[PDB]
Design a protein around this motif. Structure first.
Motif, mmCIF file in Angstrom:
data_model
loop_
_atom_site.group_PDB
_atom_site.id
_atom_site.type_symbol
_atom_site.label_atom_id
_atom_site.label_comp_id
_atom_site.label_asym_id
_atom_site.label_seq_id
_atom_site.Cartn_x
_atom_site.Cartn_y
_atom_site.Cartn_z
ATOM 1 N N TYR A 23 35.301 35.950 41.544
ATOM 2 C CA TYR A 23 34.202 35.074 41.954
ATOM 3 C C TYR A 23 33.582 35.342 43.327
ATOM 4 O O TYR A 23 34.246 35.825 44.246
ATOM 5 C CB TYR A 23 34.675 33.622 41.874
ATOM 6 N N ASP A 24 32.296 35.007 43.448
ATOM 7 C CA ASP A 24 31.529 35.191 44.683
ATOM 8 C C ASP A 24 32.045 34.266 45.796
ATOM 9 O O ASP A 24 32.028 34.627 46.977
ATOM 10 C CB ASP A 24 30.032 34.911 44.429
ATOM 11 N N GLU A 68 55.376 24.881 48.841
ATOM 12 C CA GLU A 68 54.095 24.594 48.210
ATOM 13 C C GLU A 68 52.947 25.248 48.976
ATOM 14 O O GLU A 68 53.033 25.452 50.190
ATOM 15 C CB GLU A 68 53.880 23.081 48.132
ATOM 16 N N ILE A 69 51.869 25.553 48.255
ATOM 17 C CA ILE A 69 50.691 26.215 48.822
ATOM 18 C C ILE A 69 49.384 25.472 48.530
ATOM 19 O O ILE A 69 49.335 24.585 47.676
ATOM 20 C CB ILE A 69 50.564 27.659 48.271
ATOM 21 N N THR A 70 48.324 25.849 49.241
ATOM 22 C CA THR A 70 47.011 25.223 49.074
ATOM 23 C C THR A 70 45.934 26.290 48.871
ATOM 24 O O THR A 70 45.600 27.036 49.795
ATOM 25 C CB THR A 70 46.609 24.388 50.314
ATOM 26 N N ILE A 71 45.377 26.346 47.669
ATOM 27 C CA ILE A 71 44.349 27.329 47.362
ATOM 28 C C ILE A 71 42.953 26.771 47.623
ATOM 29 O O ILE A 71 42.457 25.931 46.883
ATOM 30 C CB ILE A 71 44.489 27.806 45.890
ATOM 31 N N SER A 72 42.333 27.247 48.699
ATOM 32 C CA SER A 72 40.993 26.820 49.091
ATOM 33 C C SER A 72 39.930 27.477 48.213
ATOM 34 O O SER A 72 40.250 28.207 47.279
ATOM 35 C CB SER A 72 40.735 27.184 50.557
ATOM 36 N N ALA A 73 38.664 27.212 48.527
ATOM 37 C CA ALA A 73 37.526 27.760 47.787
ATOM 38 C C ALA A 73 36.246 27.120 48.312
ATOM 39 O O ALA A 73 36.260 25.957 48.711
ATOM 40 C CB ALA A 73 37.676 27.466 46.297
ATOM 41 N N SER A 74 35.150 27.875 48.315
ATOM 42 C CA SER A 74 33.852 27.367 48.779
ATOM 43 C C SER A 74 32.716 28.352 48.512
ATOM 44 O O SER A 74 32.529 29.309 49.255
ATOM 45 C CB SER A 74 33.897 27.039 50.278
ATOM 46 N N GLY A 75 31.957 28.109 47.448
ATOM 47 C CA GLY A 75 30.852 28.991 47.110
ATOM 48 C C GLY A 75 30.014 28.465 45.962
ATOM 49 O O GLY A 75 30.332 27.426 45.384
ATOM 50 N N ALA A 76 28.947 29.179 45.622
ATOM 51 C CA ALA A 76 28.078 28.753 44.535
ATOM 52 C C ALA A 76 28.834 28.646 43.213
ATOM 53 O O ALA A 76 28.252 28.327 42.185
ATOM 54 C CB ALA A 76 26.900 29.716 44.392
#
Lengths: 332, 87, 332, 87
Positions: free
Chosen positions: B28-29, B59-67
């Motif tokens: 993903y973009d 435990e982990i934290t999977i971020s994300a931020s995009g169209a």
DNA sequence: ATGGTACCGCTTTCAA
DNA sequence: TTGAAAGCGGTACCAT
């Protein structure tokens, strides 16, 4: 009589120079022309000739992999990381066994270099000063995988074999053991005599325990050399309370060698292997070991190489991956 | 767009699975990222991830931020449970 | 432009053509002339560019190896053979994992075919009609290693799997077993459904023993699928007196999973493995297995390919190597 | 030339070791052969030697005729023991 | 024993 | 966009 871009160039009333553009997906191509030549490439079942391209483009999308013996259980895994990340990055691989032989290791390097590789991953056991000179002479990036290079000149990737054996030795003393032995591999290798051994003798004088110059057995990673390693040790008067094997294949040889002498595990002795391969889990009892991300060591190595090959800036060339200790049943 | 997971994996984030997750992110973009024990690495970087040295438990934290941070976090979940890597 | 043959030519004060002969080793050179250029080649640190040669000579002296997974104890050991025999014949290897994924297999086939390989040693689990039609339209020879091709029309090297399992079952019948169970690998693969399994069934047939569907456990090659398999067969009312595994992995999966349930090998249950790998002599007790010259297979495969590449004729395109049964302690 | 042996290696005339022999034989002009259980094969050939299956505890003959038909036999013989493949 | 020289299939400016 | 031509590093047949 393969069909070149010329045939396609003819089979589309266009210039071979534009056939090229389409093939590599050049923007500056009118949709009509492209789509026209695309069905042509298929109408002739055309496949681009990489060699031809590599002569011109000076790029072969292929890295060279010099590995001692790809039949091993350790390296084979490493080869998977290496191989798998390179595919990710569209890079074929040239695998070649060196058998830790220097004249071979260097000869191979030259051969791959000759075949115009875009980069190399060297998994050696005795990187001398001569290797450095040869390495510094490669026109393409060279990465080291799971290897110990004193000079610290070539960008490597591995775990701290010094601190790794230390953690183990400690955990062993940190459980009562006083007469602990270390069955290393061919001391001739700088990873045994200078990294694994040190972390063993260090963690001892660090716990006051006097260095026992007879608890240091020299195996060869073999299942048998480990068998005979435990038979020699349980021969002396001051026989060890626990033994640490440089690898899993020597560790297993040890567990069985003891049971072959009626000894019981971990009741009688406490063993701890290394590398943490499928082997240290297909035994009864199950082998405790200093976990080594073999796949990660190779995959990372190949990743880092991808960077250098792209001239892209890379902070710190020498990389160290995190290691840990996983106990199973060969320890109380 | 994020979500925490509890590494159910027996070996943690390593070997092929690790490669599987990292790749999924590259699909993903969006700027997919991963946080762990106070350290955020790109989830699209084989090196950043495998350098954190994950293991069963933590435990982990999977971020994300995009169209497309949506479909992205979804996919990442798929594989996260496809290779038994947390939940 | 960087230290090329043309540079050596002027430097050694001769001609490109002559330099080329010296480089290659053509005998038509004056001992004084050769010397001149050899020293010039030395003085300029010249390395012949193999890619160029490649385009010119129409051969890259490299072969593509499409193997499913290089981290496999078997596939890895098999690879080595192919590799030791490639160097033997001045050939290089392009290794790449397919993971039995058809899509990836037919793909790599092309990648290599484009990379202008001189030949290919393919290794798979389900060679379909397509693979075949694909194999037959290769500009270079292809040889299958340790694989099964129902259409028997592609030069391959392997053992008669159907006869192996048979001789093992048969050997068990002759020991007095009347309830022999079979632990296979994925039936999807013709080597299991069409070869090994039929070898097993054909054995009891000529032994006049009834076929018990319940005595066929389908593993997945996993040392764990073995443990889980031993359990299911012991779950049955009428348990087998001996079990035959299609792989050593699953075999240890049988041994240990049993020793854990209490049973004591061999005095309680007879067990036979297959492949005779490194695991064999690395278990307790020693595993009696069907010997398959894994190394030899890839080796004879690579040699059969060198023959085809050199347009020389050969007796029987499909080759089969001998297989025996090393009996260990896992068998009374 | 001639000299019979009795394989000692559990593996026999296979694997890497077998390769060494086939090669050591290819270095002499003298056509070196290998006979076993009744059939004779070209020892300067990988397919031939391996297709034999010469298992441990077996007898084989090693001939050689031509230029270096003597020093050859000595060589193969030296290897046969340097790789634990019988006397 | 040498030198001369068309290619080998494709990438890459340079102009039109 | 699109074509024309100069290579990239060698090899091999042809002359000399």
């Amino acid at each position: 009589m393969n069909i070149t871009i010329y045939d396609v160039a003819r089979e589309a009333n266009v210039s071979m120079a534009t056939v090229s553009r389409v093939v590599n997906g050049n923007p500056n191509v009118k949709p009509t022309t492209r789509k026209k030549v695309l069905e042509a490439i298929e109408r002739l079942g055309y496949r681009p000739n990489a060699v031809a391209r590599g002569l011109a483009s000076k790029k072969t999308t292929t890295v060279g992999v010099i590995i001692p013996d790809i039949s091993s259980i350790f390296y084979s895994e490493l080869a998977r990381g290496i191989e798998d990340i390179a595919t990710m990055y569209k890079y074929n691989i040239i695998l070649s066994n060196s058998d830790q032989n220097m004249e071979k290791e260097l000869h191979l390097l030259n051969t791959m270099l000759g075949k115009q590789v875009d980069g190399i991953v060297f998994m050696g056991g005795n990187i001398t000063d001569e290797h450095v000179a040869e390495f510094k002479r490669s026109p393409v990036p060279i990465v080291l995988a799971a290897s110990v290079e004193e000079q610290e000149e070539t960008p490597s990737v591995a775990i701290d074999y010094e601190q790794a054996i230390y953690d183990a030795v400690k955990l062993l003393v940190d459980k009562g053991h006083t007469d602990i032995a270390f069955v290393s591999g061919p001391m001739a290798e700088p990873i045994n005599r200078s990294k694994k051994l040190q972390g063993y003798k260090r963690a001892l004088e660090e716990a006051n325990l006097p260095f026992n110059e007879q608890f240091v057995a020299e195996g060869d990673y073999t299942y048998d050399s480990g068998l005979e390693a435990l038979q020699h040790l349980m021969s002396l008067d001051k026989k060890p309370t626990a033994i640490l094997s440089a690898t899993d294949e020597m560790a297993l040889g040890i567990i069985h060698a003891a049971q072959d002498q009626g000894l019981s595990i971990p009741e009688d002795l406490d063993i701890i292997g290394f590398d943490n391969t499928r082997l240290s889990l297909m035994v009864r009892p199950q082998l405790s070991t200093v976990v080594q991300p073999t796949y990660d060591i190779g995959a990372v190595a190949m990743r880092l190489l991808t960077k250098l090959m792209n001239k892209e800036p890379v902070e710190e060339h020498i990389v160290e991956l995190p290691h840990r200790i996983e106990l199973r049943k060969s320890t109380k | 767009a994020q979500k925490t997971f509890k590494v159910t994996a027996d070996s943690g984030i390593h070997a092929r699975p690790a490669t599987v997750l990292v790749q999924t992110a590259s699909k993903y973009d969006a700027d997919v990222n991963l946080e762990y024990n106070g350290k955020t690495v790109n989830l699209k970087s084989i090196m950043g991830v495998m350098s954190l040295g994950i293991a069963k438990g933590a435990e982990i934290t999977i971020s994300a931020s995009g169209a497309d941070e949506n479909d992205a976090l979804n996919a990442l979940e798929e594989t996260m449970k496809s290779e038994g890597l947390g939940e």
